[PDB]
Structure formats: structure tokens, C-alpha cells
């Protein structure tokens, strides 16, 4: 079993591929732009990936990796009811370039399943796009489309840290994502099956993508404060969290 | 604190950078070239590095990382008394290109301290260069020069696995390297402090470098069968739990 893991208590490391408006400052990863006064911008799109590709599975041995990632994000919308568009943790093709903005979170182009996109993402959607989204803000699992194959309601604690945990169990093909707002004591979780070897390439770049609205006040910040990741290609979370995120 | 680790029970992944004659076959890392019949070549030079850079220290916070690496190597010299030149575990500048061959193991150019080399290595020297080496085969700690700052005698169990453990304790600035030949039940060790922040860049590539002789039958194989590495970089200016490490990763 090949194992690998990284843990960043803070950023500002040559370990990231920054695209769009993504930037590092105050040792935190700011995916979308924030003006001098500290307020969010419109039409922003930023992505950040770990500089080295991760092998998700091995075509020749049929082996499929199990992995887990955790990060703390902070989303602040000056006008809560105007929050848009969200942040997503994504697994994309290695040289991948940004996709459509706003509602597509920079990782997808349509709400129609397109295997050629070779992209899977867990989204934290703050703006309800009526053509495809649920009524409220939500956590969703996106498989080669912006229309989640499964979602769960999420109560956004504006400007409050969100502690996220995403795991993939190759044995059950189950992808689980949970979000906790320690300040409001709330927690959410979503789980669905994903046939990984069929939706993604053998090697992918893991990272984040975020965007803001295009109309006057539909914007918010999208900051990541810490990030851990562990992969095992042929996972004991109990020791993972302790020796990596806690 | 930032942490990084990996463990390879066999090679195959494209998480390795190969230079010179370095190659992967039979799921093992072969640093120096071998002929169809399985015999070593002359004037061979091969290097292999983890594709991702490791941060050894943080200039702005004064923090210095503690790390450990373990790997199993197998060195086979058709003619034992003709064994040359050796294999080295090295920390080099990220885009680093191979250096001098043969006695310099592909990581150094002279036996004169040159800080600009920005390279540290732990060598497993099978051939004695009278110009700077000790009389017998040895393990040595090289700091920006091929002339080790400290060495220890090593009894080469030809063609037998060598289990190596190298650790760096930022608290004591001590670098320790040990080698064990389980089949012959022998073991060796060396230690010396190294002011890491002064000999290397903030980010380095870790890996292996090996070479063979230029003269006659002075050659041998340089194969790596497995490799683990773990690093821990604090938030401010503490050793590492080698036990937990060694269990869930090597033993
Ligand atoms: C947060 O965003 C809301 C939706 O954009 C704002 O309400 C909207 O304000 C517009 C002027 O900026 C106005 O044309 C819309 O009719 C109105 N829409 C709704 C559904 O209320 C809201 O702005 C404040 O409240 C409105 C009603 C006006 O009084 C504005 O002058 C105010 O800025 C925003 N809320 C806050 C607390 O800023
Ligand atoms: Ca949306
Ligand atoms: Ca020598
Ligand atoms: Mn959605
Ligand atoms: Mn020597």
C-alpha cells in the first residue's frame, strides 16, 4: 500500500498552483478577491491545487485508493441573504484550467452529465440557482455536472469557521462529507456512492475552487485556513484527525 | 505544524523524478544501469527524487523540521573486492542536475567545502578514494563536500539487503544514520550535528544518487526496494516519534 499525506496549519507555501484571483495573504488561502477595505468583489473566480498529482486508482492492478481531507473554511457575506456562489473541494484533470464562473463554481460548464469533464467535487453552495439547485444553501456531491446527485441542507454561520471533513471509502465506494460550525454547534452530513474509476482519470489534482455572483451585491469571501489530506492506494480516521487536524 | 509523509513498499508511481540511468523495473528502483544478463555497467550515474519538494525549515519563523527516512537497499558487486562507488541519500536544491560521477556519487564536485553546493548527503561508500576516504567501506555524512565530516566502518554484506534509517532531530541538530544487514545480523551507526538552515535551501528534493567506477570491474548494482519518509515542521522556533513512524510505515 502506497500512503501519502500532507497537513498545512497555515499557507504561503510553494506547494500550491494558484489560478484566477486565488491568493495567499495573512497566511490564509483567499480564493476570491477582497478589496482594500476587506470587502468581497463581483465576478471573482479563484482556484488552488496541491502542486503534486494524486493517484486515485491504478488501471493495471484494479486498485482504488481510499482518502480523506479536512480543511477549515470561512465564508463571509457582507449581506447574508445576498451570499453567492460558494466554494468547492475538487478532484480535476492534472493540467485543468478554470471552467465557467458564478453558479458553476469554476469547475463545471453545464448541469448536464458530461463524463468528458472528468471532475468530481463536493460543493458548499451559498446561492440557489433555480435551474438546478435545491431551495436553500446546501452541501452537495457533484459528479461531472453542477447538478448534485445528492444534497443536504446547510445552515450557513456567516463569517464563522466551518470545519469540513470529506472521506472516500474504496471498499464501499461511498463518499461522505460533513460540515461543522463549532460556534453555532451545528453539523451537517451527506453521503452517496461514486464509481470513482469511471468518473475521473488515474491521476488528479486536488484543491479548491470558488466564485462570486455577477449582480451588485451577490458576493462573499471564500477563505481556507488549514488543510490536510491523506491517501492510501493498495483509512483509520481515528488516528488521522488526531495526528493531523486536531 | 506542517507535516508530510509517504511510504512505498514498491516503486511504480509517477511520483518519482528519474535522472541519468535511474530506472524502475520489477517494481524496484535501480539507480545504476544493468546489462541484459543482469550485470552492472561502468561509468553509470543515476538519481531519483520524490516529485514533491520538502520544506526543511521556515526562514521567516525560524522553525526547523525534524524528519526521518528509511529504505531497503541491495548492493551487489560481481567482484566484491572491486565494488564501486556507492549510493547516497541526498537533500538537494529543487531543480538540481547531476554532478560529478564515480567517486563523487553524482552529488558533489570537489572534496573542498563549497556552501554554494547547498547539498547534504548520507553516503554508503563502497570504494575508497585515497584522496579523502577512510581505508574501508564506510557510512558517511557529507555536508557540501565529498569529504565526510564523520564516517563509520561498514561491513558490506554483498548482495544482501541493507535496511537503512536516517533521522534528523531539529532540537539537537543531530543527524543519525544506521544500517542493518539482517541476514548477517550486523549493524552500524554514525552521528554528527549539522546546522541544516545554513547548509541547505528552505525547500529541497530528497532522493538517491549512485554511481559505478570508471576503471576495470569497478562496478556493482544499486537497488532500492522500499522507501518511507516523514517530516514535521513546527509553527515556531521537537524530535519525532520514531516508534509510531517505524511501525505504521516500515516494520
Ligand atoms: C441585502 O440585499 C437585499 C437584496 O439585494 C437588499 O434588498 C434589496 O435592496 C435593493 C436596493 O439595494 C432594492 O432594489 C430591492 O427592492 C431590495 N429587495 C428586497 C427583496 O428587499 C437589502 O438592502 C437593503 O434593504 C432594501 C429593502 C433597501 O432599503 C436598501 O436600500 C437596503 O440597502 C440588503 N440588506 C442589507 C441589510 O443591506
Ligand atoms: Ca448554486
Ligand atoms: Ca569513495
Ligand atoms: Mn448546488
Ligand atoms: Mn567516502
Amino acid at each position: 500500500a502506497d500512503i501519502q499525506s500532507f497537513s498545512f496549519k497555515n499557507f504561503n507555501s510553494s506547494s500550491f498552483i494558484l489560478q484566477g484571483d486565488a491568493t495567499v495573504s495573512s497566511s490564509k488561502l483567499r480564493l476570491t478577491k477582497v478589496k482594500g477595505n476587506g470587502l468581497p468583489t463581483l465576478s471573482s473566480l479563484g482556484r488552488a491545487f496541491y502542486s503534486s498529482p494524486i493517484q486515485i486508482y491504478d488501471k493495471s492492478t484494479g486498485a482504488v485508493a481510499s482518502w480523506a481531507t479536512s480543511f477549515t473554511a470561512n465564508i463571509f457575506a457582507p449581506n447574508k441573504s445576498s451570499s453567492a456562489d460558494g466554494i468547492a473541494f475538487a478532484l480535476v484533470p492534472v493540467g485543468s484550467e478554470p471552467k465557467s464562473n458564478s453558479g458553476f463554481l469554476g469547475v463545471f460548464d453545464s448541469d448536464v452529465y458530461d463524463n468528458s469533464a472528468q471532475t468530481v467535487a463536493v460543493e458548499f453552495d451559498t446561492f440557489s440557482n433555480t435551474d438546478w439547485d435545491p431551495t436553500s444553501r446546501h452541501i452537495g456531491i457533484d459528479v461531472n455536472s453542477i447538478k448534485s446527485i445528492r444534497t443536504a441542507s446547510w445552515g450557513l454561520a456567516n463569517g464563522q469557521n466551518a470545519e469540513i471533513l470529506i472521506t472516500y471509502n474504496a471498499a464501499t465506494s461511498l463518499l461522505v462529507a460533513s460540515l461543522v460550525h463549532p460556534s453555532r454547534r451545528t453539523s451537517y452530513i451527506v453521503s452517496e456512492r461514486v464509481d470513482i474509476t469511471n468518473e475521473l482519470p488515474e491521476y488528479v489534482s486536488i484543491g479548491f475552487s470558488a466564485t462570486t455572483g455577477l449582480s451588485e451585491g451577490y458576493t462573499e469571501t471564500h477563505d481556507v485556513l488549514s488543510w490536510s489530506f491523506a491517501s492510501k492506494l493498495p483509512l483509520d480516521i481515528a488516528s488521522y484527525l488526531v495526528r493531523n487536524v486536531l
Side-chain angles (χ1 to χ4, degrees), chain A residues 1-8 10-11 14-27 29-32 34 36-58 60-79 81-146 148-183 185-231 233-242 244-246:
Chain A
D2 294 354
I3 302 179
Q4 312 186 100
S5 65
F6 63 72
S7 181
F8 297 113
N10 72 61
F11 296 70
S14 310
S15 309
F16 309 103
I17 290 171
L18 304 185
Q19 308 182 318
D21 308 314
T23 195
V24 177
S25 78
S26 296
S27 67
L29 178 61
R30 317 209 71 176
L31 298 168
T32 56
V34 188
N37 57 319
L39 291 185
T41 266
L42 301 181
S43 296
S44 187
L45 183 165
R47 311 205 312 177
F49 299 102
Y50 183 56
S51 58
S52 285
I54 273 56
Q55 179 169 27
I56 295 309
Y57 58 90
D58 189 310
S60 68
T61 65
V64 181
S66 281
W67 44 272
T69 194
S70 63
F71 58 96
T72 301
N74 187 288
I75 294 173
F76 175 63
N79 187 334
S81 57
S82 179
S83 68
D85 270 293
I87 176 178
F89 170 70
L91 293 81
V92 309
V94 172
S96 177
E97 217 83 58
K99 263 58 184 304
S100 305
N101 66 181
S102 190
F104 295 92
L105 308 180
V107 282
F108 296 113
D109 286 315
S110 64
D111 56 332
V112 170
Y113 180 84
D114 178 14
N115 189 80
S116 67
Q118 291 294 79
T119 297
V120 171
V122 176
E123 59 168 58
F124 300 89
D125 209 324
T126 58
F127 173 87
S128 187
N129 294 84
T130 60
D131 286 356
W132 63 74
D133 282 332
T135 286
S136 59
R137 298 197 184 73
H138 53 285
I139 299 173
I141 296 175
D142 303 348
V143 188
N144 287 304
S145 165
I146 192 58
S148 311
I149 61 176
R150 189 67 153 290
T151 65
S153 287
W154 161 43
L156 168 62
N158 194 39
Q160 308 277 199
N161 284 173
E163 283 170 28
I164 299 163
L165 178 63
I166 304 177
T167 63
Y168 185 70
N169 188 335
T172 58
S173 296
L174 195 70
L175 192 162
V176 185
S178 64
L179 181 158
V180 172
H181 271 133
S183 76
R185 294 172 284 115
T186 55
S187 50
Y188 309 88
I189 194 174
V190 238
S191 50
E192 183 63 86
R193 186 192 307 296
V194 176
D195 185 12
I196 218 69
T197 65
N198 179 272
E199 314 295 339
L200 299 169
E202 197 163 299
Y203 291 81
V204 296
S205 285
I206 58 175
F208 308 94
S209 190
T211 56
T212 63
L214 312 176
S215 311
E216 307 302 1
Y218 291 77
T219 181
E220 65 198 2
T221 59
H222 300 282
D223 304 317
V224 180
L225 317 191
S226 64
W227 183 30
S228 282
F229 178 89
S231 191
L233 188 71
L235 177 37
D236 169 47
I237 317 302
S239 186
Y240 165 77
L241 297 176
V242 175
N244 295 307
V245 68
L246 286 165

